[PDB]
Ligand SMILES: *[C@@H]1O[C@H](CO)[C@@H](O[C@@H]2O[C@H](CO)[C@@H](O)[C@H](O)[C@H]2NC(C)=O)[C@H](O)[C@H]1NC(C)=O
Ligand SMILES: *[C@@H]1O[C@H](CO)[C@@H](O)[C@H](O)[C@H]1NC(C)=O
Ligand SMILES: *[C@@H]1O[C@H](CO)[C@@H](O)[C@H](O)[C@H]1NC(C)=O
Ligand SMILES: *[C@@H]1O[C@H](CO)[C@@H](O)[C@H](O)[C@H]1NC(C)=O
Ligand SMILES: *[C@@H]1O[C@H](CO)[C@@H](O)[C@H](O)[C@H]1NC(C)=O
């Protein structure tokens with residue numbers, strides 16, 4: 001707030017400031033533009049999924065353990081333990097200055113993240129290109145192995161070792 | 172339907188009208204800031220010179236010069252910022268043109284949503300409009316699947332596609348379009364025994380050469 | 386878009402090694418990507434023609 | 435069903451072998 | 454106590470109704486009065502049906518013209534879609550559709566000199 005910051009309660013100061021012109025219009029316009037830009041960035045980043053997908057109750061995906069990345073209802077906010085650690089490790093009107101809140105709350109961002117996770121683990125890469133085709137996760141892994149130039153048998157013959165290594169990597 | 176989408180929605184080209192509106196607003200405010208006195212006795216150098224003598228009018232002229240210099244400096248700073256932004260936008264547009272019009276990009280969501288097929292550029296007053304022709308699956312159906320087939324004590328994996336079943340029968344089909352084919356040696360390859368694979372099923376893998384060779 | 390909603394052939398855009406998949410994670414002021422990738426080992430020597 | 439289809443000999447390598 | 458006031462408006466094209474948002478103010482110290490994390494909202498009723506965000510207020514709340522009055526609501530991220538996962542079943546597309554998405558990008562400004 002130009003008045004509060006520059007002058008405060010001084011009416012003669014406000015009268016003197018009115019002589020300078022339209023500096024404060026530009027200032028407020030730029031600040032509101034920055035705010036809308038941050039909001040648009042958050043939206044474009046976290047709202048890429050079309051619909052909020054769900055996860056099956058049976059949390060079994062052929063030995064792959066996603067408990068460290070999937071949301072945990074055992075706490076108030078539906079956030080994974082990794083997300084909880086990330087949030088805990090990051091620490092977070094005064095004479096004119098104010099801080100407006102974001103449009104998407106932390107809970108909504110977490111819901112978008114959970115939807116993206118469910119889609120990725122339940123329908124492969126298809127949910128990002130059309131209807132979310134339900135596909136088994138070992139077959140998704142075979143698809144991606146073929147994608148990196150490795151045949152599917154290389155997976156299907158080591159599935160157990162691969163899943164164990166993946167769990168250890170998440171840990 | 173592209174033309175209908177462009178006609179019904181008047182705010183479809185807002186991302187392109189915004190830059191013109193911003194330039195117009197910047198010029199308008201830079202023109203209007205001339206009426207500002209900047210603490211001087213008047214905003215018109217003609218009157219400032221006519222009323223006062225040079226000795227005492229020099230301070231007022233210096234005040235107005237300082238004010239206008241600062242205003243123009245702020246204007247050019249904002250102009251440089253917006254120019255950097257539009258330079259980034261133009262770089263993105265050139266990358267999109269190069270990777271969508273001159274060819275096909277495996278990028279999943281660069282040239283529009285869905286599996287990209289091709290693109291068509293269209294001119295604009297101050298930008299570019301891309302018509303991204305894409306490929307989107309539709310009308311899907313459920314099927315039973317197995318990662319391999321156990322035949323003659325050997326495991327069979329598909330060369331391209333996946334094994335599918337509608338009950339009492341099995342077929343091979345490409346993942347992006349349903350086209351059931353008989354499981355034969357031409358569309359499958361053997362690798363080791365069928366005891367190590369998890370979830371393997373048993374089905375007849377017809378040899379395409381055995382009937383003719385017999 | 387590239388890593389989570391698909392599989393990129395870009396050799397260094399979704400983490401080191403051959404990229405398989407990635408999982409996004411929210412943050413108070415950003416996003417944390419967990420790039421699951423493939424890395425070989427035990428490079429045995431062989432004679433080729 | 436295909437438009438613009440033409441005719442030509444498609445040899446089968448199994449015939450000359452006669453296995 | 455002080456704070457900026459914003460005017461929620463559906464546009465003079467539609468109606469003259471307006472709702473005022475006192476940013477960050479707790480209206481216990483200054484027809485429907487509704488308190489949100491972004492401030493206090495006067496002139497808009499809180500509807501419990503979730504809709505797409507028309508006018509963003511903040512903290513996950515948006516406003517729009519009901520059609521009749523200005524309603525405030527918690528924005529919906531999207532419709533729930535449960536995917537039937539199974540380690541022995543798949544979904545395969547028996548069809549396809551060709552679509553044409555329209556995209557726009559600015560390339561240049563107005564060349565200016567002073
Ligand atoms: C794939 O989809 C297209 C269109 O969605 C189907 O084409 C329709 O076929 C029916 C009956 O054959 C016609 O009555 C419609 O007029 C067709 N649509 C159009 C736009 O021409 C096509 O049959 C589908 N393919 C399969 C295998 O189901
Ligand atoms: C996944 O790992 C966590 C942590 O080690 C463990 O508590 C959980 O039981 C594991 N998942 C399963 C299905 O065992
Ligand atoms: C597959 O079956 C489920 C019910 O188990 C159903 O909801 C779903 O729509 C089916 N898939 C398709 C593509 O119809
Ligand atoms: C499965 O599909 C095949 C397609 O050739 C058909 O011949 C067969 O009758 C179908 N079986 C059932 C049980 O629907
Ligand atoms: C598929 O999942 C079910 C339930 O989790 C399980 O009983 C079954 O053994 C699984 N199939 C295989 C091949 O592991």
Ligand SMILES: *[C@@H]1O[C@H](CO)[C@@H](O)[C@H](O)[C@H]1NC(C)=O
Nearest residue numbers: 425426427428429430431432
């Ligand atoms: C392959 O040969 C090189 C050169 O003799 C040697 O340094 C390397 O260790 C060999 N590979 C392995 C896996 O030992």
Ligand SMILES: *[C@@H]1O[C@H](CO)[C@@H](O)[C@H](O)[C@H]1NC(C)=O
Nearest residue numbers: 436437438439440441442443
């Ligand atoms: C190919 O041969 C078929 C029958 O032998 C005939 O009907 C058709 O017209 C021929 N097409 C061409 C291009 O020769």
Ligand SMILES: *[C@@H]1O[C@H](CO)[C@@H](O)[C@H](O)[C@H]1NC(C)=O
Nearest residue numbers: 181182463464465466467468
């Ligand atoms: C008034 O015009 C605006 C601008 O396009 C539009 O968004 C709104 O729907 C219009 N309202 C009516 C009642 O026509």
Ligand SMILES: *[C@@H]1O[C@H](CO)[C@@H](O)[C@H](O)[C@H]1NC(C)=O
Nearest residue numbers: 478479480481488489490492
């Ligand atoms: C507003 O004040 C009331 C009464 O002290 C309190 O219960 C409420 O939590 C406050 N809300 C905000 C957003 O400050």
Ligand SMILES: *[C@@H]1O[C@H](CO)[C@@H](O)[C@H](O)[C@H]1NC(C)=O
Nearest residue numbers: 497498499500501502524525
């Ligand atoms: C929404 O629910 C609250 C809580 O029960 C209630 O006070 C309010 O009147 C409801 N809104 C409408 C439009 O009914």
